[PDB]
Short mmCIF file of C-alpha atoms and ligand atoms in Angstrom, two decimals:
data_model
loop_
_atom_site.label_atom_id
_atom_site.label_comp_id
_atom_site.label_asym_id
_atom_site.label_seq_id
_atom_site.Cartn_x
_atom_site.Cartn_y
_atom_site.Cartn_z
CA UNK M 27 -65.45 113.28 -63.54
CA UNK M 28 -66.67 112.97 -67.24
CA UNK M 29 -63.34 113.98 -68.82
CA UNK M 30 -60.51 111.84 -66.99
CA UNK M 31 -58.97 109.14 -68.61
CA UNK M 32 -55.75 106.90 -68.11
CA UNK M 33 -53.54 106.56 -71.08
CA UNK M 34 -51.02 103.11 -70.65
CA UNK M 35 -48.85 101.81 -73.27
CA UNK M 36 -48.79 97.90 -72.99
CA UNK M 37 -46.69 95.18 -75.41
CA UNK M 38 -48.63 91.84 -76.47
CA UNK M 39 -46.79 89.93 -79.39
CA UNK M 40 -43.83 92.26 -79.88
CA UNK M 41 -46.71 94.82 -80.66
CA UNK M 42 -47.60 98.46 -79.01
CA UNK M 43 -51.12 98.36 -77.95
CA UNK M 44 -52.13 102.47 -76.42
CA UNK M 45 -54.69 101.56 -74.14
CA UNK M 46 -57.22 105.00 -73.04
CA UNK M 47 -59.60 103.75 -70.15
CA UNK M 48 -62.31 106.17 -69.61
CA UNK M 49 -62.14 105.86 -65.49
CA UNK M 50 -65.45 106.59 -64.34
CA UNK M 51 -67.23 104.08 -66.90
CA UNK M 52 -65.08 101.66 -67.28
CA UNK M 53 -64.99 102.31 -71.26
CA UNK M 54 -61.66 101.52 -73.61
CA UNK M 55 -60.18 102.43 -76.70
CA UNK M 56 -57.27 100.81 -77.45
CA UNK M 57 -55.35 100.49 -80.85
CA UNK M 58 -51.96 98.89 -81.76
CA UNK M 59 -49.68 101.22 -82.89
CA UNK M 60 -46.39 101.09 -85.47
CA UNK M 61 -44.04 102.10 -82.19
CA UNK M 62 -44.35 103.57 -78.89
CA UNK M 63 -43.17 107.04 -79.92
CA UNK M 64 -44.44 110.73 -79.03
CA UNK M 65 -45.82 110.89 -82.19
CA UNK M 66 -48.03 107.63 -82.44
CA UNK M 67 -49.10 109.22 -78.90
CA UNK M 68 -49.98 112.60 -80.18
CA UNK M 69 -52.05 110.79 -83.17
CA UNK M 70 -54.11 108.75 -80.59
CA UNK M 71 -54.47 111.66 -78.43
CA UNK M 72 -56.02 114.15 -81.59
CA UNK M 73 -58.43 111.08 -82.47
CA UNK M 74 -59.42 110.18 -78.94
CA UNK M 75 -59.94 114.07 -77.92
CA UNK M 76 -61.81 114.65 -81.45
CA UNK M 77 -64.45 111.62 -80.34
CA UNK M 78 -64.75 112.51 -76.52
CA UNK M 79 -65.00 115.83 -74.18
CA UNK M 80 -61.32 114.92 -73.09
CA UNK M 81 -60.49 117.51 -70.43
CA UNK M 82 -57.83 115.65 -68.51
CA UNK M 83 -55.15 112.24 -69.61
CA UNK M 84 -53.41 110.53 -66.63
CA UNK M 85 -49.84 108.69 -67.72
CA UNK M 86 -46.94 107.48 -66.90
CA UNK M 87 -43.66 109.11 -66.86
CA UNK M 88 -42.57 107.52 -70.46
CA UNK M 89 -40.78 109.23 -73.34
CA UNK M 90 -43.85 108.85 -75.46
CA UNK M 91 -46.31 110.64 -73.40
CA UNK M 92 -43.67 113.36 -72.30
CA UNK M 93 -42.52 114.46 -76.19
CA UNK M 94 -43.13 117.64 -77.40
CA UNK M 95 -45.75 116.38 -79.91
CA UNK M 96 -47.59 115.54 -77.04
CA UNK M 97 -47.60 119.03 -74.97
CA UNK M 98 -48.64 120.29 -78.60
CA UNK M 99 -51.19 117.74 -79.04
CA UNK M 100 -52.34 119.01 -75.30
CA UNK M 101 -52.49 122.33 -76.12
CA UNK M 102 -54.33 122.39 -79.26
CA UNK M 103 -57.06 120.46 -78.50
CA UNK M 104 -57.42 121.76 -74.56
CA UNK M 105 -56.40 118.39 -72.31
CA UNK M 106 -54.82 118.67 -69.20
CA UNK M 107 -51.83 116.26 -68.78
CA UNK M 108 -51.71 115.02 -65.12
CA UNK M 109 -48.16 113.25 -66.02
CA UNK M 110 -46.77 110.47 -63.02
CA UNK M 111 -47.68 107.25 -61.38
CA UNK M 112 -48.59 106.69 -59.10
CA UNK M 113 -51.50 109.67 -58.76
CA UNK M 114 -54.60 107.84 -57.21
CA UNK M 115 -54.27 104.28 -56.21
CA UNK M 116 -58.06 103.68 -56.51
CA UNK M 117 -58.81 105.24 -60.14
CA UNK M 118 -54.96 103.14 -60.73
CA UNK M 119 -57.15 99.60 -59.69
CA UNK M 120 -60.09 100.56 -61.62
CA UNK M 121 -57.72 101.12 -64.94
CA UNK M 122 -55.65 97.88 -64.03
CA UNK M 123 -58.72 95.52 -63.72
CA UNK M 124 -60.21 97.16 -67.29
CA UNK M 125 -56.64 96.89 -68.80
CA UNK M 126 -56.66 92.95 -67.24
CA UNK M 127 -60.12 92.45 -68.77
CA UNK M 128 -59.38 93.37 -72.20
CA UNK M 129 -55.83 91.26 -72.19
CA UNK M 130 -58.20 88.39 -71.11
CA UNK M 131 -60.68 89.18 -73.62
CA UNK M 132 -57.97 89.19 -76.57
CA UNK M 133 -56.75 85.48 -75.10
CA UNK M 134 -59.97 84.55 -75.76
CA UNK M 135 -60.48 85.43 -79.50
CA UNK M 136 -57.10 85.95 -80.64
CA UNK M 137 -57.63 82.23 -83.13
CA UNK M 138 -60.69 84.03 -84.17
CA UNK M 139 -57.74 86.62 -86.36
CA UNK M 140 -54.74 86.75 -88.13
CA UNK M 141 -53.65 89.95 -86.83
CA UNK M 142 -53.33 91.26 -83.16
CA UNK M 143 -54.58 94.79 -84.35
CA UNK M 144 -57.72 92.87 -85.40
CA UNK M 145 -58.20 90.99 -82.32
CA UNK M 146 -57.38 94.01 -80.24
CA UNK M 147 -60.60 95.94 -81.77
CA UNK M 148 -62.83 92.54 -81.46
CA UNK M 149 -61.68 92.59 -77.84
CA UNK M 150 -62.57 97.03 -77.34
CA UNK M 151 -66.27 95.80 -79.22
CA UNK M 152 -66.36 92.99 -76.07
CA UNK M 153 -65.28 94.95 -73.59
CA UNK M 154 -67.35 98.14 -74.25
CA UNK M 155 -70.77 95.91 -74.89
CA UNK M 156 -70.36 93.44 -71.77
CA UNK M 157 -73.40 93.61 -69.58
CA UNK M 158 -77.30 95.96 -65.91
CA UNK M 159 -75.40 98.78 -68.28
CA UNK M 160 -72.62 98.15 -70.31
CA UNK M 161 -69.31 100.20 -70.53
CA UNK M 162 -70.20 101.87 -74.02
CA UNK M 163 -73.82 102.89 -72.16
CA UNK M 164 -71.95 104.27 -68.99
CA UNK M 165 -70.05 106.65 -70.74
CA UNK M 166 -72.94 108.06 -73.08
CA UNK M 167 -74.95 108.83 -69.62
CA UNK M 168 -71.73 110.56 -68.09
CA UNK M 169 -71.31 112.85 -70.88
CA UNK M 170 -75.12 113.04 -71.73
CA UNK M 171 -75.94 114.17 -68.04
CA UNK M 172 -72.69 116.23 -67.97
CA UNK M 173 -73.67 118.55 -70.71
CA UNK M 174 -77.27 118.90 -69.00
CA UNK M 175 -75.73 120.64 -65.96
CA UNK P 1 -82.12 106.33 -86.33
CA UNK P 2 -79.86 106.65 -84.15
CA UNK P 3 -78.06 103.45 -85.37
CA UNK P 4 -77.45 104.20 -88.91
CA UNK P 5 -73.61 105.18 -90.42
CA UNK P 6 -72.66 106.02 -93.52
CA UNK P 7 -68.89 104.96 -95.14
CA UNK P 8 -67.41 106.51 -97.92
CA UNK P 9 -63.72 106.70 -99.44
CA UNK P 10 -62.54 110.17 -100.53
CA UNK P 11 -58.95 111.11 -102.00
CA UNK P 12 -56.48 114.14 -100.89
CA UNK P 13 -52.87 114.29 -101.68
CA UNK P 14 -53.25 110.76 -103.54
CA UNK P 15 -54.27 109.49 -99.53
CA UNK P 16 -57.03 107.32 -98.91
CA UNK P 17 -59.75 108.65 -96.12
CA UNK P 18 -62.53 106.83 -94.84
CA UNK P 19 -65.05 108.75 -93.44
CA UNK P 20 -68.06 107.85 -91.51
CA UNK P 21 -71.04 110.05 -90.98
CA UNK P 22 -73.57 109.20 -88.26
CA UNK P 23 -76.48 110.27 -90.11
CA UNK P 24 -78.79 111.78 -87.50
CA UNK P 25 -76.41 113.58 -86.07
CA UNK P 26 -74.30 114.75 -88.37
CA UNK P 27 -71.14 113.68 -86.33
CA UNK P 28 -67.91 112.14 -88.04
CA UNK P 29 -65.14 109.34 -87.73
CA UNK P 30 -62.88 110.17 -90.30
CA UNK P 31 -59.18 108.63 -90.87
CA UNK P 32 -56.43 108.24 -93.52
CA UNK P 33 -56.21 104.38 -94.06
CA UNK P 34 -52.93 103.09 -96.37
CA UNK P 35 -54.84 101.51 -99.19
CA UNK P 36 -58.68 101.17 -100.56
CA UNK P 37 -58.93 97.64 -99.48
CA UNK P 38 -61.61 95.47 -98.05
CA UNK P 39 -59.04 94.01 -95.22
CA UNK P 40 -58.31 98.65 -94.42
CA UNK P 41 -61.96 98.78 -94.88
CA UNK P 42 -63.13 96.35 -92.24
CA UNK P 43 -60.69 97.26 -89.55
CA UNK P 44 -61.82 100.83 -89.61
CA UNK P 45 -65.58 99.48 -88.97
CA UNK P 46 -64.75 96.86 -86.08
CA UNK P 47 -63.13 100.08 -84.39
CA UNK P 48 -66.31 102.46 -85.01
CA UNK P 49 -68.32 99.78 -83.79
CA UNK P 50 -66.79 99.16 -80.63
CA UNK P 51 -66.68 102.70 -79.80
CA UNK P 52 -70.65 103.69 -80.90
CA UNK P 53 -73.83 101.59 -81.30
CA UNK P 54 -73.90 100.18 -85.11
CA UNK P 55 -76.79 98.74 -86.16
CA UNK P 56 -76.76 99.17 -90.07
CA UNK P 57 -74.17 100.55 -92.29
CA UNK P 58 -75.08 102.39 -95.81
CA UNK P 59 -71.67 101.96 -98.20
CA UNK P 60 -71.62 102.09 -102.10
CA UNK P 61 -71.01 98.92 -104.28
CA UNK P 62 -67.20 99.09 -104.59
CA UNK P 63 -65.23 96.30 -104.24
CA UNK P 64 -63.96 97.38 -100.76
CA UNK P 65 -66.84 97.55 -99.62
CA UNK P 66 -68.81 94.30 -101.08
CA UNK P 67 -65.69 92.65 -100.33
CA UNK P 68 -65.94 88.82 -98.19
CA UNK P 69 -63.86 91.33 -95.41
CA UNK P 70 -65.81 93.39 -94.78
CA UNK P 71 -68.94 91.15 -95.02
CA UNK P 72 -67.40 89.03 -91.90
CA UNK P 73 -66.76 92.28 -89.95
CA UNK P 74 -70.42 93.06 -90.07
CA UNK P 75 -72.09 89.85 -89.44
CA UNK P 76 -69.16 89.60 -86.55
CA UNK P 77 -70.17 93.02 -84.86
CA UNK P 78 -74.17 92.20 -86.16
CA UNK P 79 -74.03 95.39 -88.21
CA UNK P 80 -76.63 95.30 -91.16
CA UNK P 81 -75.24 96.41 -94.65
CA UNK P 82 -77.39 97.58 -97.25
CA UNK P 83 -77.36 96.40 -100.87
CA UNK P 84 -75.76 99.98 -102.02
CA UNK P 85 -76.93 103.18 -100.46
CA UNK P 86 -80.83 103.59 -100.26
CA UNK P 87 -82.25 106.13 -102.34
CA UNK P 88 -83.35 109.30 -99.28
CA UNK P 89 -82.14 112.39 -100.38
CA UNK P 90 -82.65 113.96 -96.74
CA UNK P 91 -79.84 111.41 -95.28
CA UNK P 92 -77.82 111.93 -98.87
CA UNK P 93 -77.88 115.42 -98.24
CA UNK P 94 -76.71 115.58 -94.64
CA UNK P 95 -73.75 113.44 -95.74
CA UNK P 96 -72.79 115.53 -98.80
CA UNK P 97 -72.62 118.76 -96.81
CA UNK P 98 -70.52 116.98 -93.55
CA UNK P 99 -67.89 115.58 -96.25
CA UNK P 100 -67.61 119.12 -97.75
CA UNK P 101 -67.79 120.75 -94.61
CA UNK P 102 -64.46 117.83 -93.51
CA UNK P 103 -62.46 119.21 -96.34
CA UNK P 104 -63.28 122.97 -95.95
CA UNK P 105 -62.04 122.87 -92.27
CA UNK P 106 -59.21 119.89 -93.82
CA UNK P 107 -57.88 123.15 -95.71
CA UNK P 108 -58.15 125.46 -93.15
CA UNK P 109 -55.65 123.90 -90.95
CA UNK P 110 -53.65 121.61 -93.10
CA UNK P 111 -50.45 123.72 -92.77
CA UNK P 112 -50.40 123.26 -89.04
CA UNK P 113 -49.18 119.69 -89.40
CA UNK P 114 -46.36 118.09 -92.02
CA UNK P 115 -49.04 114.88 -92.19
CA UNK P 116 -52.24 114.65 -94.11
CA UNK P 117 -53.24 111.72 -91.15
CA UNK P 118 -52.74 114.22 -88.38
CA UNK P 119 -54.64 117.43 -90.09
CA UNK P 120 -57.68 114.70 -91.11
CA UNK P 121 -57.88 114.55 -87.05
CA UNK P 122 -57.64 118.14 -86.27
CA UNK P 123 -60.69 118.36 -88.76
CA UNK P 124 -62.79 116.18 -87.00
CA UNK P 125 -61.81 117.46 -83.93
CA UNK P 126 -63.41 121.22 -84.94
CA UNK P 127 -66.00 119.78 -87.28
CA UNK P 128 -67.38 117.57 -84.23
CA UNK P 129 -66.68 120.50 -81.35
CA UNK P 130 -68.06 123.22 -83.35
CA UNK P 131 -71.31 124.69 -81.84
CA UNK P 132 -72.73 126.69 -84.27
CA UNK P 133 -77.47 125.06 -80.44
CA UNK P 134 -75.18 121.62 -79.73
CA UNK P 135 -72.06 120.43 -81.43
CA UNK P 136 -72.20 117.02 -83.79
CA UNK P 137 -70.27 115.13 -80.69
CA UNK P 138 -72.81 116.58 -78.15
CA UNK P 139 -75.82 115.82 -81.05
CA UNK P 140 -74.48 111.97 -80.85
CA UNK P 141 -74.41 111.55 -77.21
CA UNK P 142 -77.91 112.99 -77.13
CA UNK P 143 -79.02 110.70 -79.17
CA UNK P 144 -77.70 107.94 -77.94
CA UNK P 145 -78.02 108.43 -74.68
CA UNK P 146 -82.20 109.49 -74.93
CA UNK P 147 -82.39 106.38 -77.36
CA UNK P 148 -81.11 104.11 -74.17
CA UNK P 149 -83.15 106.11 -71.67
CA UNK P 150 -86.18 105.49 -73.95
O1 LIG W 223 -48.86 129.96 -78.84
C1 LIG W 223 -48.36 128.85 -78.49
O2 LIG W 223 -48.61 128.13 -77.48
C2 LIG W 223 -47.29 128.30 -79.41
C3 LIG W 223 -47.96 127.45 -80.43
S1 LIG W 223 -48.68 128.26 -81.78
C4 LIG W 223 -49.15 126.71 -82.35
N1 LIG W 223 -49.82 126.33 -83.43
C5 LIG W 223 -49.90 124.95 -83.35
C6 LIG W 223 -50.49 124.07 -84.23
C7 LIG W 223 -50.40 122.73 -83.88
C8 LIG W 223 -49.76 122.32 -82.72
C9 LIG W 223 -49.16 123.19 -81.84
C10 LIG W 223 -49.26 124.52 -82.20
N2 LIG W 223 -48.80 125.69 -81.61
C11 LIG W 223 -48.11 126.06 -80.48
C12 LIG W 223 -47.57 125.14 -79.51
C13 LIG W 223 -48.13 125.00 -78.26
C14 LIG W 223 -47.59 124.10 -77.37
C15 LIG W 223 -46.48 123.35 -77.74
CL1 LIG W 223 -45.79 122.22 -76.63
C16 LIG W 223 -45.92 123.50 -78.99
C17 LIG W 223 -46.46 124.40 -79.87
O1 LIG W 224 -57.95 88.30 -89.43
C1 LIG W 224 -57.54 89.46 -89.71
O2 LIG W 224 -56.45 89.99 -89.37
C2 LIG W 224 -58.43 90.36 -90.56
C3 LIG W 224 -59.13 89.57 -91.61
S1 LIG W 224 -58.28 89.26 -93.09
C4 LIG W 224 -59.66 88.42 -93.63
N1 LIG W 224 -59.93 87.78 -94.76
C5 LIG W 224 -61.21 87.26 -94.59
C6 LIG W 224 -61.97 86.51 -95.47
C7 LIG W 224 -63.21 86.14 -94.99
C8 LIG W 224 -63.67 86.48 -93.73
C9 LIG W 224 -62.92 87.24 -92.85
C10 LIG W 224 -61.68 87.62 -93.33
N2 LIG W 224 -60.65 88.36 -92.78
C11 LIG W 224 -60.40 89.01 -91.59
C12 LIG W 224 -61.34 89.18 -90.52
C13 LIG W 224 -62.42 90.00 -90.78
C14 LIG W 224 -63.36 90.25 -89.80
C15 LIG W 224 -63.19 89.70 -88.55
CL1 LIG W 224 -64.36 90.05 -87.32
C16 LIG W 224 -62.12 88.88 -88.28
C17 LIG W 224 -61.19 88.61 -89.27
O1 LIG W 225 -46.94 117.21 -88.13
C1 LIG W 225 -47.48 116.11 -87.85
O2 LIG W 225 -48.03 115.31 -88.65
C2 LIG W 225 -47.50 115.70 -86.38
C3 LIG W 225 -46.61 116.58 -85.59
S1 LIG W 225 -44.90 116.26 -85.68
C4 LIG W 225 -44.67 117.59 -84.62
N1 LIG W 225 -43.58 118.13 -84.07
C5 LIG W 225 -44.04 119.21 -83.32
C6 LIG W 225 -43.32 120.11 -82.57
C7 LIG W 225 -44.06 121.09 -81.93
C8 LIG W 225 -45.44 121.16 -82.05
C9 LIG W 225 -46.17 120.25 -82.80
C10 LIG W 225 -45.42 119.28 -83.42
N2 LIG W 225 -45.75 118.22 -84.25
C11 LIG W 225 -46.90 117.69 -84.79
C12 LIG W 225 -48.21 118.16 -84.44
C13 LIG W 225 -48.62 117.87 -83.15
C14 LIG W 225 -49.86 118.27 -82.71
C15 LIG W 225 -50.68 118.94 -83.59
CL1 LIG W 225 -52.24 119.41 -83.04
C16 LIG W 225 -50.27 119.24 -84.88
C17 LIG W 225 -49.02 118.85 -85.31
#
């Protein structure tokens, strides 16, 4: 469905990265963040739901993604949160291999920054313009063809 | 073109905002960043241009902007940056009414958050959902999307 995504908080460096995988294409934004609270969460949410037709956010059963701010967050901008894991062992595969990708991916150019926040966006660019369509190009069709029908 | 962006800094509340307008659609990235520096400045591009197709960038001649940064995030990402912002009033135009049209609906809802950063993204949320007939985030993916299909 055009609107699902997977929302995981991950540590790399004694860092927060939010990690949103777009599960039908494959596509990521990802951001470190100053601390894995409700209302880092809430922020990520508003920007990722201003940017996409977010209808629905998959996550885990942490303090961050349960927070008031959140359910606010939720409600204002019209996203369903599907909240426990597991909920769908395939679309939880797809996520894992895109989340392993883009770990592998900031190996791989993390001399090429100071900063982890840096390397983590060099990593999203990567990810989402790897090629014979690339993640970036699945998505666009999803939501182009979506708002045709 | 469906590849051209253009950056500018505005001021509320003594906050920095960088805003990006994607020209033929009208659509907008917009965030709070902590300071007007080239290092804030070229973090905020490597993460639009990871997210959309950037081909060329249109900025003014400040010294975020012309800064060695933000030149390396550009030729990294193979984004081309103009020397200042080329004289086309049509393009000018669209991007004077979307930044006044940011801070009219900025207004509007500031009071329903204590931060300037989270009622900057409530703002772009309505100004890119609005369908006054497509909406500025349904305008993009049009664009996009026919400019792959073509
Ligand atoms: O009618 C309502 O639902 C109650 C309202 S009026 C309202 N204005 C808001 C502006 C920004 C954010 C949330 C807002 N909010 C809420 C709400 C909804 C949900 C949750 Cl968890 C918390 C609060
Ligand atoms: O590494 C960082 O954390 C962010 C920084 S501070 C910095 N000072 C620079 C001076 C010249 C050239 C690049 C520079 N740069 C960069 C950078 C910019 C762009 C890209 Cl792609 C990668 C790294
Ligand atoms: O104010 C802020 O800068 C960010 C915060 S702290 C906060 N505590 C809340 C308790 C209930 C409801 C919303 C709350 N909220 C918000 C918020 C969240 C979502 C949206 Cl849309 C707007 C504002």
């Amino acid at each position: 469905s055009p609107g699902i995504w997977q929302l995981d908080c991950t540590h790399l460096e004694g860092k927060v990265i939010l990690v949103a995988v777009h599960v039908a294409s494959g596509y990521i934004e990802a951001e470190v963040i100053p601390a894995e609270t409700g209302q880092e969460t809430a922020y990520f949410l508003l920007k990722l739901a201003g940017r996409w037709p977010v209808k629905t956010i998959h996550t885990d059963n942490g303090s961050n993604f349960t927070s008031t701010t959140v359910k606010a967050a939720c409600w204002w901008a019209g996203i369903k949160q599907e909240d426990g894991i597991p909920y769908n062992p395939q679309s939880q595969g797809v996520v894992e291999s895109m989340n392993k990708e883009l770990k592998k991916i900031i190996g791989q150019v993390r001399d090429q920054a100071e900063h982890l926040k840096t390397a983590v966006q060099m990593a999203v660019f990567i990810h989402n313009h790897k090629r014979g369509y690339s993640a970036g190009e699945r998505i666009v069709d999803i939501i182009a063809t979506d708002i045709q029908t």
